[PDB]
Amino acid sequence: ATTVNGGTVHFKGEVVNAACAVDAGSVDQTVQLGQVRTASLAQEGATSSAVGFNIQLNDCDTNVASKAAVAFLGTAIDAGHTNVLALQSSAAGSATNVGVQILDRTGAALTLDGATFSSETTLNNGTNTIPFQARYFATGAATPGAANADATFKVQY
Amino acid sequence: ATTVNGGTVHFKGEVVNAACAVDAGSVDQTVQLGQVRTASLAQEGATSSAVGFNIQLNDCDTNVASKAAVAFLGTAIDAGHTNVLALQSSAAGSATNVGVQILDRTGAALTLDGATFSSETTLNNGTNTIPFQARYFATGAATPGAANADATFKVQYQ
Amino acid sequence: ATTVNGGTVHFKGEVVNAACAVDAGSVDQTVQLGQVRTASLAQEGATSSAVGFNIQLNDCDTNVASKAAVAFLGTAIDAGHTNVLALQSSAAGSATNVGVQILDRTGAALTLDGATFSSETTLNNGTNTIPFQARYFATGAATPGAANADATFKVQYQ
Amino acid sequence: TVNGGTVHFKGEVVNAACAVDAGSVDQTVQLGQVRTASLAQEGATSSAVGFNIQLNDCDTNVASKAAVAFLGTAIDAGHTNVLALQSSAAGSATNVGVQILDRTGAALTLDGATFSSETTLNNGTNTIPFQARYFATGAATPGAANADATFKVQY
Amino acid sequence: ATTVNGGTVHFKGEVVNAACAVDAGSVDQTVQLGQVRTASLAQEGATSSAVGFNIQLNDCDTNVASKAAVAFLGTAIDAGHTNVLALQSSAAGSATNVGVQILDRTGAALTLDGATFSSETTLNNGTNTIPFQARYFATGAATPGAANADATFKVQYQ
Amino acid sequence: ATTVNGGTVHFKGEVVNAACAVDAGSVDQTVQLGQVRTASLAQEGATSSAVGFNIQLNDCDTNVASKAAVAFLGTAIDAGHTNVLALQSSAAGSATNVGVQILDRTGAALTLDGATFSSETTLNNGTNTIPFQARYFATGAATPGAANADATFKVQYQ
Amino acid sequence: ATTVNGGTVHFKGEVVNAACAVDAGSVDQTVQLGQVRTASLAQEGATSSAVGFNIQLNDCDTNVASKAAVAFLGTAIDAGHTNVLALQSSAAGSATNVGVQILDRTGAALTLDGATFSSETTLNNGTNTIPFQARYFATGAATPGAANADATFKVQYQ
Amino acid sequence: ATTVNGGTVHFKGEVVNAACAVDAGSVDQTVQLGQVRTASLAQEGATSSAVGFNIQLNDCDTNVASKAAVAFLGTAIDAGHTNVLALQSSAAGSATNVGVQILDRTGAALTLDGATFSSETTLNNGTNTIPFQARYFATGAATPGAANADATFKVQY
Amino acid sequence: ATTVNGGTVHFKGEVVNAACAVDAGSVDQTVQLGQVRTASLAQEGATSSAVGFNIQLNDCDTNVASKAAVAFLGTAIDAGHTNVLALQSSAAGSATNVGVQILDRTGAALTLDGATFSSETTLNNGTNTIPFQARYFATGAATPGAANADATFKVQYQ
Amino acid sequence: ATTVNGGTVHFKGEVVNA
Query: Do the two chains G and E touch, given a threshold of 8 Å on CB pairs and at least 3 pairs?
Result: yes
Chain-chain contact of B127 with E93 (C-beta, under 8 angstroms): yes
Enclosing H/E stretch for E134: strand E128-138
H30/G10 Cα distance (integer angstroms): 4
Nearest CA in chain H to A129: H5
This structure's resolution (Å) is 4.0
Reduce the secondary structure of D9-54 to three states and give it as a string. CCCCCCCCCCEECCCCCEEEEEEEEEEHHHCCCCCCECCCEEEEEE
Number of C-beta neighbours around residue C85 at 10 A: 26
Residues 6+ positions from G62 with CB-CB distance below 8 Å: G123, G124, G125
Contact of D94 with D140, CB cutoff 8 Å? yes
| Backbone dihedral region for residue A93 (phi beyond 0: left; psi -120 to 50: alpha; all else: beta) | left
> E87, E64, E84, E67: which is closest to E76 by C-alpha?
E84
Taking the alpha carbons of I151, G147, C58, C16 in that order, is the dihedral positive or negative? positive
Distances (CA, A) of A128 to A131, E5, F33, G91, I136: 10, 17, 27, 22, 43
Distances (CA, A) of D132 to A136, B10, D33, E116, H107: 38, 11, 13, 25, 55
Buried b (16+ CB within 10 A) or exposed e, I43-75: eeeeebeebebebbbbbbbeebbbebbbbbbbb
CB of F15 less than 8 A from some CB of B: no
> Strands G21-22 and H46-47, how do they pair?
unpaired
* Alpha-carbon radius of gyration of chain E: 19
Chain-chain contact of C5 with D60 (C-beta, under 8 angstroms): no
CB of G15 less than 8 A from some CB of E: no
- Alpha carbons within 13 angstroms on the beta-carbon side of residue H127 total 23
Residues 6+ positions from I135 with CB-CB distance below 8 Å: I33, I47, I48, I49, I50, I51, I100, I101, I103
Chain I neighbors of H27, CB-CB under 8 A = none
Query: Do the two chains D and G touch, given a threshold of 8 Å on CB pairs and at least 3 pairs?
Result: no
Contact of I47 with I84, CB cutoff 8 Å? no
Nearest CA in chain J to F54: J8
Nearest-Cα distance to chain A for E71, in Å, is 18
- In a mutational test of the C interface, the residue from A64, A127, A128 whose CB has the highest number of chain C CBs within 10 Å is A127
- Alpha carbons within 13 angstroms on the beta-carbon side of residue I25 total 9
Residues 6+ positions from D83 with CB-CB distance below 8 Å: B11, D70, D72, D73, D74, D75, D97, D98, D99, D100, D110, D147, D149
Chain B neighbors of C82, CB-CB under 8 A = 106
Nearest CA in chain D to A3: D142
Chain-chain contact of C129 with I8 (C-beta, under 8 angstroms): yes
Number of C-beta neighbours around residue F138 at 10 A: 24
Contact of G96 with G147, CB cutoff 8 Å? no
Residues paired with I155 in a beta bridge:
I70, J4
State residue I26 phi and psi, 5-degree precision.
-85, -30
Amino acid at C38: T
I31/I47 Cα distance (integer angstroms): 17
How does DSSP classify residue H76?
B
Query: Do the two chains F and C touch, given a threshold of 8 Å on CB pairs and at least 3 pairs?
Result: yes
Contact of D81 with D109, CB cutoff 8 Å? yes
Chain F neighbors of J4, CB-CB under 8 A = 124-126
> C153, C154, C136: which is closest to C145 by C-alpha?
C136
Chain-chain contact of H91 with C21 (C-beta, under 8 angstroms): yes
Enclosing H/E stretch for C26: helix C24-27
Contact of H82 with H112, CB cutoff 8 Å? yes
CB of B61 less than 8 A from some CB of E: no
A30/E24 Cα distance (integer angstroms): 12
Residues 6+ positions from B63 with CB-CB distance below 8 Å: none
For the range I101-108, what are the long-range contacts, defined as Cβ-Cβ under 8 Å and sequence gap of 24 or more? Answer: I101/I47, I101/I134, I101/I135, I101/I136, I101/I137, I102/I72, I102/I132, I102/I133, I102/I134, I102/I151, I102/J9, I103/I50, I103/I132, I103/I133, I103/I134, I103/I135, I104/I70, I104/I132, I105/I130, I105/I131, I105/I132, I107/I133
I71/C13 Cα distance (integer angstroms): 54
Chain-chain contact of A90 with D124 (C-beta, under 8 angstroms): no
H helix and E strand count, chain B: 0, 9
Enclosing H/E stretch for C103: strand C98-103
* Inter-chain Cβ pairs, chain E and chain G, closer than 8 A: 12
- Chains touching G, CB cut-off 8 Å, 3+ pairs: C, E, F, H, I
What's the residue count for chain E? 158
> G96, G99, G94: which is closest to G79 by C-alpha?
G99
Burial bucket for residue B93 (CB in 10 Å: 0-12, 13-18, 19+): exposed
CB of E77 less than 8 A from some CB of D: yes
Residues 6+ positions from A102 with CB-CB distance below 8 Å: A72, A83, A85, A109, A110, A112, A132, A133, A134, A151
- Chains touching F, CB cut-off 8 Å, 3+ pairs: A, B, C, E, G, H, I, J
Contact of D116 with D107, CB cutoff 8 Å? no
> E21, E28, E90, E6: which is closest to E58 by C-alpha?
E21
> E75, B157, E79, E109: which is closest to D47 by C-alpha?
E75
Selected residues 123-152 of chain C with any CB under 8 Å from a CB in chain B? 145, 150-152
C48/C95 Cα distance (integer angstroms): 15
Reduce the secondary structure of chain I to three states and give it as a string. CCCEEEEEEEEEEEEECCCCEECHHHHEEEEEEEEEECHHHCCCCCCCCCEEEEEEEEEECCCCCCEEEEEEECCECCCCCCCCECECCCCCCECCCEEEEEECCCCCECCCCCCCCCCCEECCCEEEEEEEEEEEEECCCCCCEECCEEEEEEEEEC
Chain-chain contact of F93 with E24 (C-beta, under 8 angstroms): no
- At G26, is the secondary structure helix, strand, or coil? helix
Nearest CA in chain H to E104: H75
Number of C-beta neighbours around residue G106 at 10 A: 7
* Alpha-carbon radius of gyration of chain F: 19
Query: Do the two chains D and H touch, given a threshold of 8 Å on CB pairs and at least 3 pairs?
Result: no
State residue A35 phi and psi, 5-degree precision.
-65, 140
Nearest-Cα distance to chain F for C5, in Å, is 16
Contact of G11 with H29, CB cutoff 8 Å? no
Question: Chain-centre distance of CA C157, in angstroms?
Answer: 18
Largest Cα–Cα distance in chain E?
A: 70
Chain C neighbors of G87, CB-CB under 8 A = 49-50
Number of C-beta neighbours around residue A113 at 10 A: 12
Number of C-beta neighbours around residue H33 at 10 A: 22
* Inter-chain Cβ pairs, chain C and chain I, closer than 8 A: 12
D73/D80 Cα distance (integer angstroms): 9
Nearest CA in chain A to C146: A127
Chain A neighbors of F87, CB-CB under 8 A = 49-50
CB of B36 less than 8 A from some CB of C: yes
Chain H neighbors of F65, CB-CB under 8 A = 1-2
I141/I135 Cα distance (integer angstroms): 16
CB of F24 less than 8 A from some CB of C: yes
**Which of E58, E60, E144 lies nearest to residue F90, judging by beta carbons?**
E58
How does DSSP classify residue E112?
T
D103/D105 Cα distance (integer angstroms): 6
Chain A neighbors of C145, CB-CB under 8 A = 58-59, 126-127
- At G38, is the secondary structure helix, strand, or coil? helix
A154/B25 Cα distance (integer angstroms): 31
* Inter-chain Cβ pairs, chain A and chain C, closer than 8 A: 28
Nearest-Cα distance to chain E for D58, in Å, is 13
Chain-chain contact of H149 with G20 (C-beta, under 8 angstroms): no
Number of C-beta neighbours around residue D107 at 10 A: 18
Question: Chain-centre distance of CA D47, in angstroms?
Answer: 16
Enclosing H/E stretch for A27: helix A24-27
Chain-chain contact of C14 with B126 (C-beta, under 8 angstroms): yes
Reduce the secondary structure of F23-41 to three states and give it as a string. CHHHHEEEEEEEEEECCCC
**Which of A107, A122, A136 lies nearest to residue F76, judging by beta carbons?**
A107
Residues paired with D147 in a beta bridge:
B11
D84/D138 Cα distance (integer angstroms): 13
Chain F neighbors of C154, CB-CB under 8 A = 3-6
Contact of I72 with I150, CB cutoff 8 Å? no
> Strands C3-16 and E28-37, how do they pair?
parallel
Residues 6+ positions from E42 with CB-CB distance below 8 Å: E138, E141, E142
Q: What is the dihedral of CA H37, H40, H43, H44, to 10 degrees?
A: -80
* Alpha-carbon radius of gyration of chain G: 19
Contact of G142 with G98, CB cutoff 8 Å? yes
Residues paired with C84 in a beta bridge:
C101
Amino acid at G145: G
Reduce the secondary structure of C28-77 to three states and give it as a string. EEEEEEEEEECCCCCCCCCEEEEEEEEEEEEEECCCCCCEEEEEEECCEC
A132/H70 Cα distance (integer angstroms): 38
CB of F25 less than 8 A from some CB of G: yes
Burial bucket for residue D74 (CB in 10 Å: 0-12, 13-18, 19+): middle
Chain G neighbors of F21, CB-CB under 8 A = 92-93
State residue G145 phi and psi, 5-degree precision.
155, 170
Residues 6+ positions from F52 with CB-CB distance below 8 Å: F131, F132, F133, I75, I88, I150
Amino acid at B77: I
Determine the Cα angle at F131 with ends F126 and F133, to 5°. Answer: 165
Contact of F49 with H23, CB cutoff 8 Å? no
- Chains touching A, CB cut-off 8 Å, 3+ pairs: B, C, D, E, F, H
Chain-chain contact of E126 with F4 (C-beta, under 8 angstroms): no
